[PDB]
Amino acid sequence: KLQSTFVFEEIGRRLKDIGPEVVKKVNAVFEWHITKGGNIGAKWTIDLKSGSGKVYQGPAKGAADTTIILSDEDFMEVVLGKLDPQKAFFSGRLKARGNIMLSQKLCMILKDYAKL
Ligand SMILES: COCCOCCOCCOc1ccc(C(C)(C)CC(C)(C)C)cc1
Ligand SMILES: [Cu+2]
């Protein structure tokens, strides 16, 4: 059981409401590899390229623009504000592949949706 699952499911619920506005600012597809034992326990895609966006399990149906790899616990610590994702990147706990420049847009945008 991964705690990250609750977050991804809630994100999916959120996008059915704020999706269209999130997809216009981001315009990208994000893949997530959540580890538990250095072992990938779950893969998630957050597609923000059309409509209201979508969250689904597994690898991206097409190319992912950015892939983020981190532990279940570290993901949760970033979600709860206890671990800065940029510090985690420079420390080696958070890995990012692909277009790392796109990673900025995502946190900032949903956060601003976390204050409404
Ligand atoms: C151009 O960037 C310079 C290098 O900095 C890299 C920073 O990388 C950290 C940002 O990547 C993340 C990591 C996690 C997240 C969260 C977990 C907040 C996204 C979420 C809540 C939608 C899962 C967002 C962006
Ligand atoms: Cu920033």
Numbering used by the authors: 5 to 120
The publication says:
The Kamer and Jarvis groups have extensively studied the human steroid carrier protein (SCP-2L),23 a single-domain 13.5 kDa protein containing a hydrophobic tunnel, as a scaffold for ArM design. The steroid carrier protein type 2 like (SCP-2L) domain of the human multifunctional enzyme 2 (MFE-2) has previously been used as a protein scaffold for both regioselective and enantioselective reactions using covalent modification through the introduction of unique cysteine residues. Here two methods for site-selective incorporation of bipyridine into the SCP-2L scaffold were compared, and the copper-catalysed 1,4-addition of indole to enones was used to analyse ArM activity. Crystals of SCP_Q111CBpy and SCP_Q111BpyAla were soaked in solutions of Cu(ii) ions and their structures determined by X-ray crystallography.
The structure of Cu(ii)-bound SCP_Q111CBpy was determined to 1.52 Å resolution, and clearly confirmed the incorporation of 2,2′-bipyridine at C111, which is positioned at the centre of the C-terminal helix, α5. The bipyridine rings are sandwiched in a parallel fashion between the amide side-chain atoms of Q108 (one turn up on α-helix 5) and Q90 on α-helix 4. The B-factor of the Bpy moiety is 92 Å2, suggesting flexibility in its position. Additional electron density was observed in the 2Fo–Fc map around the solvent-exposed face of the Bpy moiety, and a single peak in an anomalous difference map confirmed this is a bound Cu(ii) ion. The Cu(ii) atom lies in the same plane as the two pyridine rings and is 2 Å from the two pyridine ring nitrogens, and thus we assume that the Cu(ii) ion adopts an octahedral coordination geometry. The high B-factor (108 Å) of the Cu(ii) is consistent with its position in the flexible α-helix 5. Only one water molecule could be modelled around the Cu(ii) ion, but the positions of Q108 and Q90 suggest that their amide side-chain atoms may play a role in coordinating the other (unmodelled) waters in the coordination sphere. The longer linker to the protein backbone in SCP_Q111CBpy, which has an additional –CH2–S– compared to SCP_Q111BpyAla, allows it to extend out from α-helix 5 and adopt a more exposed position on the surface of the protein, compared to the BpyAla which is closer to the scaffold protein. In addition, the longer linker confers greater flexibility (as reflected in the B-factors), explaining the lower enantiomeric excess. The Int1proR,C has lower energy (6.7 kcal mol−1) than the Int1proS,C configuration (9.8 kcal mol−1), which favours the proR configuration pathway over the proS pathway. This is consistent with the experimentally observed preference to produce the R enantiomer by SCP_Q111CBpy.
